[PDB]
């Protein structure tokens, strides 16, 4: 299959900034490449086709160009509507193939997360399961490492995390990590801690609570 290598996969930029996405083809595709935009709401729109032709419904700040096997999409001056996902699509050969995509997010200054930890409710414990929640609030950038330690033993594979979209007003993220344990296991342990590392934190932040206490 004809591979499309799209780079970068992720990009943080500010309004007014100029940005270029690129897709490299394994084999000659003769300009048969389109650039697609997928808004946050999921809808997909074609911006450029035949590598350089601007789609009628697309703003002029977008343009395509190709250098040999490199096809690029450039946004002259980023506006708020441009923060989205972008995919290049080739239609030179079959099967049709897409680049891996580029997620464009708003760049802002780093902001350490506010971390909160939540013991399981006695209400939940009555059901045989225990969920411990570690909350990372209003941070930037998105990258954050959360580890669960139960009586200082690193927990693995028993937690799941969720991250909200970048906030519309402050451009921050919030992350939730949930550690699930059987009621039995939960009661076999005392210290529950959630250790957070993030670029805005000069050192790991650990929030904990004791079961054999408050």
């Amino acid at each position: 299959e004809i591979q499309l290598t799209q780079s970068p996969s992720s990009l943080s930029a500010s309004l007014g900034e100029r940005v270029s996405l690129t897709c490299r083809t394994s084999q000659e595709i003769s300009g048969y490449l389109s650039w697609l935009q997928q808004k946050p709401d999921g809808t997909i729109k074609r911006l450029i086709y035949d590598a350089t032709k601007l789609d009628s419904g697309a703003p002029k700040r977008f343009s395509g160009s190709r250098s040999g096997s490199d096809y690029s999409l450039t946004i002259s001056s980023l506006e708020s509507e441009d923060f989205a996902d972008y995919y290049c699509l080739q239609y030179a050969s079959f099967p049709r193939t897409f680049g891996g995509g580029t997620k464009l997010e708003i760049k802002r200054t780093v902001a350490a997360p506010s971390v909160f930890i939540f013991p399981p409710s006695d209400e939940q414990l009555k059901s045989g399961t225990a969920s411990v929640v570690c909350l990372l609030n209003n941070f930037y950038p998105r990258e954050a490492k959360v580890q669960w330690k139960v009586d200082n033993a690193l927990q693995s594979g028993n937690s799941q995390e969720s991250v909200t979209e970048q906030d519309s007003k402050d451009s921050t993220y919030s992350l939730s990590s949930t550690l699930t344990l059987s009621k039995a296991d939960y009661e076999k342990h005392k210290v529950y801690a959630c250790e957070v590392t993030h670029q805005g934190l000069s050192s790991p932040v650990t929030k904990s609570f004791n079961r054999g206490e408050c």
Binding site: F118, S162, C214
Partner: protein
Amino acid sequence: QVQLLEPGTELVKPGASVKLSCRASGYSFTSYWMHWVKQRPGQGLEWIGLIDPSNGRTNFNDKFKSRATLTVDTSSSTAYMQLSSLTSEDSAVYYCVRIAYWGQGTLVTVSSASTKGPSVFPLAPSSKSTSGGTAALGCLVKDYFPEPVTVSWNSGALTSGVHTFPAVLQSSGLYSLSSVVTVPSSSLGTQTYICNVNHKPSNTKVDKKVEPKSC
């Protein structure tokens, strides 16, 4: 002018099949190839194949050839994609696409899971919350299926500082979501916080007052 209409969402069990429809309007149906593209949640786009409505000739991506049937009903300008022997890897937004226009997509969720209302548990401000004058509290909406669940606070009276996280699929096949809000720690004695949880798919309505506990 060009319209590509697809169904909303579909829940199917493993091993079952799904027959997605894509109704086109605004142009000559048979004059254009219809493509079907798959997109797993938070994943990239994957081309499944195309069908030439004019003759019925289809062209597939080897990964789907053995399980996907692409048919067309030119009388109703509808292309269909039947995907057989579904497994959880087939849970995705499936789009029908023709040169330049993308359908809004249909979210197909494959799960052996049954309908179930959420258990709503309070995420209480204990001491391990309060970040000075800021406490965090919330509700853990656990073990419900299928998505979605709406959570509001104090009947829409509280919008600021609220973060309702995308749901995660637990290994049990049931979802779980959390809604949290950051509030002045000093308001905990003069203000009541209630998360209003509504899982319309099982019509389970729940109001949980999230009360501070400090032993």
